[PDB]
């Protein structure tokens, strides 16, 4: 009989779904052929970037003394990190709002 | 009859979240943003990997096109870490076959 099936995610040590990522690469008309390491590498990168945002957003949620990440916390996480802000520079996060920012000339004189 | 089966990254974002912050939850609206983010970044990398194969007359997208696409798309130190994570996963997977 065949061996007990292991997910490719498990072999890669990933949470993100290598098998689904491979199907999406094959179905997405990106190339005639998709190499076996391509979905493993891509799934690892997508997982890493997901963890990077969720860490910063979970900190922002905790700073607001809230247990759930909401869109506000994702916006605060992205806009306060220089590199994620550059990656997501043209992205609008719905219900995110804006960073608190008042130009110094607008503040009242002492 | 139940509604048509629609795939999402939601379960994987949650599994990553509980590694990063085991006591933190996420709202349904925030999860929809995270699902949009993963789909967006996927299409950016797969799109640039597609062009790299085309410019070099390759039929195949490999981990090497993915690695170069990551070095093109991600800024700065975010690229350095992502390339490391991708290389580590492919190394482990290859040892496990």
């Amino acid at each position: 009989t065949r061996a007990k099936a292991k997910t490719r995610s498990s072999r890669a040590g990933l949470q993100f779904p290598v098998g689904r990522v491979h199907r999406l690469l094959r179905k997405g008309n990106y190339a005639e052929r998709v190499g076996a390491g391509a979905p493993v590498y891509l799934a690892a990168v997508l997982e890493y970037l997901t963890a990077e945002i969720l860490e910063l957003a979970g900190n922002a949620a905790r700073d607001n003394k809230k247990t759930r990440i909401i869109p506000r916390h994702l916006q605060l996480a992205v806009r306060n990190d220089e590199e994620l802000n550059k990656l997501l520079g043209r992205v609008t996060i719905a219900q995110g709002g804006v960073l608190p920012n008042i130009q110094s000339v607008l503040l009242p004189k002492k | 009859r139940r509604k048509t089966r629609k795939e999402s990254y939601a379960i994987y974002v949650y599994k990553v979240l509980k590694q990063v912050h085991p006591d933190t939850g996420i709202s349904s609206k925030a999860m929809s943003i995270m699902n949009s983010f993963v789909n967006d970044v996927f299409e950016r990398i797969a799109g640039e990997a597609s062009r790299l194969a085309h410019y070099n007359k390759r039929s195949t997208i490999t981990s090497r096109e993915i690695q170069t696409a990551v070095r093109l798309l991600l800024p700065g130190e975010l690229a350095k870490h992502a390339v490391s994570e991708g290389t580590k996963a492919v190394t482990k997977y290859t040892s496990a076959k």
Partner: peptide
């Protein structure tokens, strides 16, 4: 700093 930058995450794992």
């Amino acid at each position: 700093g930058r995450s794992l």
